[PDB]
Amino acid sequence: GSHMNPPPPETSNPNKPKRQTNQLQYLLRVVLKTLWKHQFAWPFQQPVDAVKLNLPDYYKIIKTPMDMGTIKKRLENNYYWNAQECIQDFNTMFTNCYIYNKPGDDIVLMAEALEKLFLQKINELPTEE
Ligand SMILES: O=C1Cc2ccc(Br)cc2N1
Secondary structure (H helix, E strand, C coil): CCCCCCCCCCCCCCCCCCCCCHHHHHHHHHHHHHHHCCCCCHHHCCCCCCCCCCCCCHHHHCCCCCCHHHHHHHHHCCCCCCHHHHHHHHHHHHHHHHHHCCCCCHHHHHHHHHHHHHHHHHHCCCCCC
8 A cells, every 4th residue: 555545544443432233234234235236336445545546636635535445344343333423434435525526527426326325225224223
């Protein structure tokens, strides 16, 4: 990994309290699963590598980066305390794309397709038991 990309978001921290919830289980088993296999997932499956993409201003603009590879690791190595934290990561990922890129750009259309799917699934986020 290039020194000119930031370190990725935190995925492991023993000091942060962790909990499994049914909602977090749904986020992994249903939401992440659904979005990961989408035809348009690939740009979002890992941190933006601004060096390889020749976007030297990316991390000048995007100060709260997030991606589904990070979210997958956070879900699989349960990082979260609640589903809101994970939903916020997805929302951050989409908003980064919409802030950095022009409306109607391919990457935006791809993000918008994943977000539509995401919204459908989050509307069915089960009641916390
Ligand atoms: O917004 C972003 C993230 C990203 C992922 C993939 C490609 Br190609 C371009 C970009 N720019």
